[model samples]
Target: SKYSQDVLQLLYKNKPNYISGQSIAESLNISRTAVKKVIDQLKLEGCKIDSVNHKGHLLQQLPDIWYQGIIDQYTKSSALFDFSEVYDSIDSTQLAAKKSLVGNQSSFFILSDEQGQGLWMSVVLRPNVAFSMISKFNLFIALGIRDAIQHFSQDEVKVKWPNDIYIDNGKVCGFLTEMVANNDGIEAIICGIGINLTQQLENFDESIRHRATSIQLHDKNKLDRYQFLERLLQEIEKRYNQFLTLPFSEIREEYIAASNIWNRTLLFTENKQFKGQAIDLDYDGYLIVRDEAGESHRLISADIDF
Candidate 1:
């Protein structure tokens, strides 16, 4: 009965054009009577199904969740992945990607529409190295589905360091990187990015209204999650290959130029809030911070409230 309910939910959510009773029975390994019973049960539960003379049954409307469209849109692309978006729920996309990697489905593309309480980071450093680099660099970038790099400004963008993407004085998006290793070589790196699309101060919970913003809040709307994810995959593919062939210095320079912390004072949370002047980025992509006593400290992880 539970499985039948799940089946009904799947049918309701996918809204497939036509699914035959025989096929459904075979897939679920139940009798035709059982399949019919489930379909009737769903109809009783308010599922709208259309049945034609020749055509099989069809569900009318899908569930109103974000993942359905994301999953339906997945396709084989040249950049990195042929994605399979998880519809219902999963603990972590990182964990799912790791399992997929071990099962020989190395993936890269993503559209995680339901990951709550996410951790964010940038794409500049090694996957394992980025978290520490965030702490050491005292840098971060906020992602806004709406914001763009300034048209012709020379103002350096400061990172809250490591995970948050920001520009000017507001937050934009968050990034998360996950790695899975195989027997011979690296399997894949799942880079999970979440851009604030349209949630404004009022859209946020009362507690975090002061911190979060969306592109709509900034009067920017040319970009959405779909287009942004497509562009990110393209950009990441370009940068990833370049990092393999080019010298590390060039990559570092590019990241620094794009980053918001080349030369500025940053506050970091280590044991306590440590204030320091950001002097430079190290070879390994760590933030070099000069404190009041002229002591240099390398940070590894902390949220930037500024």
Candidate 2:
């Protein structure tokens, strides 16, 4: 709890120099045994906490990536979310996330990284809303992700329909949301968000080259994956929290403002080929489409394209 934070603070306060364990225990009003446990926990969390000849604990180096400890530190982890860790490659962060989901009664996240892998992140939450409300979550997640990219890139970015993030009119990020529900209403929601932060234009195959872009392709400065993710998680948490209390009208306005599908003739299908003018998102976050006959159709998760 606070003991870990207080101990870390003490270590930071006496950086490049060590303080006695008794001094920290005294400062934090904890027993000597509890203080030792805190240090052990810090070490397990990937902090290079050192104790040299009883000179006491000091953080030699911070965790390099968004390790479990670092993720906890950056996120508003009191009750909103926690983190799960796993194999950096060959394993699925989504699978790791679900295990944490059932184990934890609240929202939590999982992240894994590799040099060749761009971003593999998953978050599971219990929204406790109805099935219709569950359907609106894709809209909220799109808004939240675009908010982070907009804030981080300081450039023009837009979301297309339910949940497609585009930069420079090219698809750069995407998401897949899964649900577990019953007649009792909705239960848990799983979000699998993938982003291209380090890919170059030439790196793509002959296919998808012109239609795809990455954060690195737009910016020259190096971006820390952890920092970018921290921003993303914070924005998402803020937006998800808002959905619990905010009206759809207000959220819809924000989503529409950041949308790129309005007034355009997009292609989709409903057991048949269809084309329609993208009008607006309906009350339940369904896409409103007006076909050639000028009649409105509510599209729920239909594949759409420009």
Candidate 3:
């Protein structure tokens, strides 16, 4: 039988301090013998558990951030929605979410202590592409990889167009949204978001320091990454539910208001960089801009001027 991973998790998180076998048994509602069996099994799996005859058990070290604290925070009422969080290893959260749905309405979230080799960019190279295909099923969120630009000395983190977050022209976070369908119509949509934390600009390739950064560099005070993630999920959920109850017009305006790009002169690829004033966003979420020629263009993706 499979021992509850949660039991092992509890032990792993509160390690260095003996946790009573009774406490474990009571928490998991299993017999003390079962708890001992589970711990023995974990030990066989290379989990270093320290146990004393009367002193109880202590997990040698904190297993990893993937422990219950993160999971618990993710379950708070402010959580955008129910999501499955995988710790440590995976090909990618976006890829994992797609595979996990298995024809059901579900979303997957992937978190790691670190992403040694950053993430591959997901680019949309066309115009007015409808997200309805992937919007109905899953969402992907990635954390840790914000270590692209450590040289910049400013707090100018911003989310760029198409699919990335930036701080002063450097990348910081990324989001991928996936969708699923069922016989009952649209079933689920998963939104995956990734942010870099703890890493410094010095960790990136010399070339990347000019293009990537981490949250720590921007905010010196201990900015709880887990807490921020919960807040972000809450924000996403609120917006998602609001879109369901209200028309796109209301949502569109609010998104634009929060974008911080309106009225700014932007550069685009079409005219080798024509100056354009951002007037508003279109119904489909494209930026509506009037260029120097008094011509209007809908930008689905582009590098920002600032």
Candidate 4:
């Protein structure tokens, strides 16, 4: 086991109280010097640790979940998903989840602390359908994220058309869906999501600074990553189970109700830059926008400017 990770668990279990170097060393069967070194490494990883003269060290801020065992313990259902693979840093959880795809492994979730960008996660689903029929799944997952955030933060969460979660009209989360298919039907769909859990304002690009937000910004309470993940997975699982039997139109209605752009004028880039009022969502989960000429256009894919 990584000494830092072990040290974190020890510190977390003894929160609000400093743990002596001797105790940590004896617990991990390492020397006091090794324990101190691990503490230094943890501090470099964004953890706030304070060492007193007589007292050893106290963890002022806990790090995000970085172990598979902790994730397994918090996740509610094992039948709906498989063991989560937690990474301290990864290029992309979507790529990691895709690379781990195999037979008999139909569904699973992948998590990463940092993707060199933000909090990265992905879920692999082997739904029995064609690639074209899985468009609503995007909306389903988006709503899952919206519902999860609302439940935790008690803040109003809205979906921006196809697959973006918005708070206070600012983008907080987005998803990228990838699919594999054959002549018979769709094989797998990997839904990768990036959430701005605790991103600071300075981290955002200059262009999107005004339109980006995070959970920490809306809620001052420090987020428990483990608890948040558990709730989010449960919400998604509930929606997924309902999706298997409910009509797409019914789910679409619910998605429309949660959307922030309905009947609102927004700029979209497609063949050309133009503004239109987003009237409603089509049966196929596309955005129905009415231009100034009183002509309704069904947008399958377009960049939305809010």
Candidate 5:
């Protein structure tokens, strides 16, 4: 698998030009047969590779780079975070991160190509905070994703309360958080995130087509996933380091400013349906809702009817 990634990078750097297997093998210090096997694997994964008779292989199109090489190449600094594993495909990065935690790996990032549904990944954290403060981790990542979206699309993006990212009033990203605990307290938190990146308008399921949007729809230019991811990780590292030291009030205020729900009338369902005007975000990051009855309630979690 590593050989395949190496070959991919080599071919990508030499796009539109054929590189002989002998040269590739010589450069990588691998056997010509190994080069051939990796190329075959890449092709099987839907890479567009042109094999000339004796000239060798020409990379016609670059395949998705969702591997360790990406993090290594794009990460400018790794003081706070480092990628622990990268996969071409996985059932779920959430499960993968949990599995790694069981193996005693506490802090890391899991990057996957297409998690069954779309580009899925998770960040594992062991913050030195109480179990109750775990909710702040959700806000940290939401801010990071918001920064990434704004950088790439140049469009106004907003957070929808606890976990969703919205652009132009449509859902573009969602987050899920899971935690591990022991007698001492919370051990780790694995926050899984899924973003609608390149899915075409017609590709969405009929149920979500009207509400789902992607980066491709907003920006017509080519989207380099690797570059976007690199910048996102950088933002995350910067924000995460601040999170560990700064007061929760500061982070809460920033999230509220970046959100679009403040002072807006929204509907949510829990025990029953209730419509309320969004007032403010509490210190614990819960949505402060003043219901039609004029009573203020702090929502821990709810199915937000957007």
Candidate 6:
């Protein structure tokens, strides 16, 4: 199964070019019969391809279900996530994580697609860390996404606290986390990154209309989410690996550097409506806010008006 996708991925990256059989066979170190056999194997599953004895093959367009192939390849390389599936849109991605997520070190790369209109992203992670580290997990995950977005678009994108990404005066994306636990300890961590694809203001609700935005709105040539998706997978894996071993000061400093709210005057709308200057993120990844009265408050979700 994994052997077949090597040809598939090679063709995809090469795009509209023909890969010679000699090249494919030599690159994979397999015989021409086996090399060409996987192309037929891929075609049997739904991907369209064209081939000849002289010209190798070209991936015309991928199957709707070919995402798992890419997942398999990445599991061999960067993200060790073992599976790929869309969120059971019938239920919450969080609920799906709780109901059937395999215990211990199981992981999944989840995407929810609206008939290819938009890509709603969520990752199910089961880390070996304490249950309380979920905050920092969300922190770096957002920064990972910010880095990926920078590669494609040169927009002024910054992470608004905890992990909401704001680009060009509108809310582009955010992190919604759910850690389902058993009697013993945490079982699964579902980190949802909700990105706006092609939605206009009407797609958002009445209240959030002013606050919501999408990636399509900010792109010069928009909605090739595959490009964004591939880079995002690579980045999150690096960030997650670093989160496991990288020093906290370095991670905190990076988050603070990427933070849109860092050192800005922000108004806390909840509980008597006071204002505070966003100071720093503490060791635990909580926000440190300096109030007008020269006091400090540690906020878990600092939902301040940006």
* The best candidate in terms of lDDT: 4
TM-score of 3: 0.64
Order candidates by TM-score, high to low: 5, 4, 2, 6, 3, 1
Give candidate 2's TM-score.
Answer: 0.76
lDDT (Cα, tens digit) per residue for candidate 6, span 1-306: 566777887777677899987888888888988987888888997788888767778888765443545555555664457776753243355455555576446687666554244556668877777756656777778888888877765577888876678876788876788777778887777887767666766777778877777776677775566667778888888888877776556788878888788666789754457788988888887778888897888887757786
Task: Report the Cα RMSD per candidate.
Answer: 7.8, 5.7, 7.2, 4.3, 3.5, 5.5
Task: Give the better candidate number (3 or 4) by lDDT.
Answer: 4
Against the true structure, candidate 5 reaches a TM-score of 0.83
* Model 5 clash tally, residue pairs: 0
Each model's lDDT comes to 0.51, 0.75, 0.54, 0.78, 0.78, 0.73
Model 4, 25-80: lDDT tens digits are 99989999999899888888777889887788887864664655446554434668
The per-residue C-alpha lDDT of model 2 at residue 160 equals: 84
Considering TM-score, which of the candidate structures 5 and 6 is the better prediction for this target?
5
Error of 6 at 166 (Å): 0.7
Give per-residue lDDT, candidate 6, residue 52.
71
lDDT per residue as tens, model 5, 1-306: 779778877887676689999999999999999998998998997778999888999877655556564354443357656445888788899998988877564578888877723557788888778766677777777898889877777578898877898888668899888888887887787889898777777879788888788766677686767666777777777777767777668888888889888676789776678989888878777778888898888887876675
lDDT of candidate 2 over 89-172, digit per residue (tens): 647676666666664566777777652427778888888776556677788788889888776574688998766899867888
The TM-score values for the models, in the order shown, are 0.59, 0.76, 0.64, 0.78, 0.83, 0.74
**Over 4 Å off, model 5:** 9-27, 36-61, 68-77, 270-272
Runs in model 4 deviating more than 4 A are 2-62, 271-273
Q: List clash counts for every candidate, in order.
A: 26, 0, 29, 0, 0, 0
Shift in Å, residue 176, candidate 6: 1.4
